[PDB]
Amino acid sequence: KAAESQIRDVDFASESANYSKANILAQSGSYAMAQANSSQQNVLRLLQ
């Protein structure tokens, strides 16, 4: 049973690290997309 547990079950020690890391990365990526969408506003200053 212990040998099976070594193969199948996840260790929350590393799992919570992975999760929190991916969450911070998600926040950063969302900010990056929000900035990328707006990166083209400066063209309007040429036209106006």
Binding site: K1, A3, E4, I7, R8
Partner: protein, 48 residues
């Protein structure tokens, strides 16, 4: 694959434990029953 094989083997052994315990119960019943026959034969020989 390995995890499923080990799970199958663990379940099989967990059931084999109960099989062995049932065999233990049967054998203990038989022996503790033979005790009285031994005492009765002793009494028969004493009466003879």
């Amino acid at each position: 694959a390995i995890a499923d094989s080990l799970r199958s083997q663990a379940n099989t052994l967990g059931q084999a434990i109960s099989n062995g315990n049932d065999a233990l119960g049967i054998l203990q019943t038989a022996d503790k029953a033979m005790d009285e026959q031994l005492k009765i034969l002793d009494t028969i020989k004493t009466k003879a």
